[PDB]
Amino acid sequence: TDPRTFTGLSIVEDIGDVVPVTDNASPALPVSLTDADGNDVVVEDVSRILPLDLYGTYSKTIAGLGLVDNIVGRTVSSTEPALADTEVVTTGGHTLNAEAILNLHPTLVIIDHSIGPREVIDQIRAAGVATVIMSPQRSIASIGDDIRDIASVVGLPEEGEKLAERSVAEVEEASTVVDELTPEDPLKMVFLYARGTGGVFFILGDAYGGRDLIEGLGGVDMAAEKGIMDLAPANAEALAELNPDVFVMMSEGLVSTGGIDGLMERPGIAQTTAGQNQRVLALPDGQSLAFGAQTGELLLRASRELYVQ
Numbered sequence: 001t002d003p004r005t006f007t008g009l010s011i012v013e014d015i016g017d018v019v020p021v022t023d024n025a026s027p028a029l030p031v032s033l034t035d036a037d038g039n040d041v042v043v044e045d046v047s048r049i050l051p052l053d054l055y056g057t058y059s060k061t062i063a064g065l066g067l068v069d070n071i072v073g074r075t076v077s078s079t080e081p082a083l084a085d086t087e088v089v090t091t092g093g094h095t096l097n098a099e100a101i102l103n104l105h106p107t108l109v110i111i112d113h114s115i116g117p118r119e120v121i122d123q124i125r126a127a128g129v130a131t132v133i134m135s136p137q138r139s140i141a142s143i144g145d146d147i148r149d150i151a152s153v154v155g156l157p158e159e160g161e162k163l164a165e166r167s168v169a170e171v172e173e174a175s176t177v178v179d180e181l182t183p184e185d186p187l188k189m190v191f192l193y194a195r196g197t198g199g200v201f202f203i204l205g206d207a208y209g210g211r212d213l214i215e216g217l218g219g220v221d222m223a224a225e226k227g228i229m230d231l232a233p234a235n236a237e238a239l240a241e242l243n244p245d246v247f248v249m250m251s252e253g254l255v256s257t258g259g260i261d262g263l264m265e266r267p268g269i270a271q272t273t274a275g276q277n278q279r280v281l282a283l284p285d286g287q288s289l290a291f292g293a294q295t296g297e298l299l300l301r302a303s304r305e306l307y308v309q
């Protein structure tokens with residue numbers, strides 16, 4: 001069949017919790033490291049972990065290594081079922097809340113600068129909480145290395161190597177399937193971030209890693225073609241210029257702008273090829289740009305939705 005003739009929403013259901021590589025993780029502590037910001041940090045107690053980022057990666061990796069029970073708080077992005085009853089430490093979306101963090105008495109914060117403010121991260125460290133700044137590569141090729149880096153922080157190198165190899169095998173296997181399913185002329189795609197019916201409506205660019213996702217799905221990322229490094233408002237002119245065949249979105253994001261019907265009311269959407277086919281691939285918010293352990297499964301399920309009727 002011809003995937004350019006497909007119409008309407010395709011939605012991938014939540015992939016769920018990461019399958020841990022072990023049932024008896026025993027962190028080898030203490031660890032000393034120099035983090036991505038150049039801070040020397042000693043990690044001596046991982047009993048109460050806050051694994052915080054924009055993308056939902058770290059919480060999933062920590063669970064994959066065998067430490068899900070050690071997670072005591074989360075951001076809005078870590079939507080995995082195991083953490084559904086865990087205290088949320090961000091507000092207004094992605095803003096760190098120092099009070100919420102400190103009241104959980106964490107023993108380890110794993111974080112990066114995808115969320116802020118930086119001042120809150122500094123406050124937590126000054127209060128005595130071991131805080132480790134990561135700077136993950138966030139590419140499909142580097143899924144294993146990003147996992148090994150997290151594993152080192154919590155003193156689980158063997159679990160890290162197992163989880164890395166398992167995840168990389170899964171994502172290469174999925175790629176084999178994607179390559180068989182892709183059309184000769186790749187679909188043009190963009191990653192459209194929406195939250196609400198107002199101005200939070202953006203084409204995501206290089207910094208957010210969606211090119212890696214779109215190319216992993218066999219598509220061409222029009223944001224990369226147009227040189228969008230951070231993000232761009234998805235206004236009528238930008239949409240007309242990018243003219244994707246498919247909008248890749250987050251499922252709850254799409255709901256928040258009124259579903260397909262609400263999306264079609266936004267200026268410029270209906271005029272694109274994707275708009276004229278109402279063609280949206282909706283991915284679970286907390287996995288969509290998390291990469292990490294579940295990347296292979298995400299690519300497999302999403303490619304089935306894109307290319308199989």
Ligand code: HEM
Nearest residue numbers: 054055056076077092093094193195200208252285286289
């Ligand atoms: C790129 C990775 C991102 C992920 C995985 C992500 C994920 C999420 C999730 C899961 C929520 C909670 C929605 C809900 O509870 O239904 C949320 C909320 C929110 N996000 Fe993001 N987000 C991302 C990036 C962004 C960006 C780039 C912006 C702005 C430029 C943004 C602005 C917001 C705002 C304002 C909210 C508040 C929604 C509310 O009040 O319910 N997010 N995000």
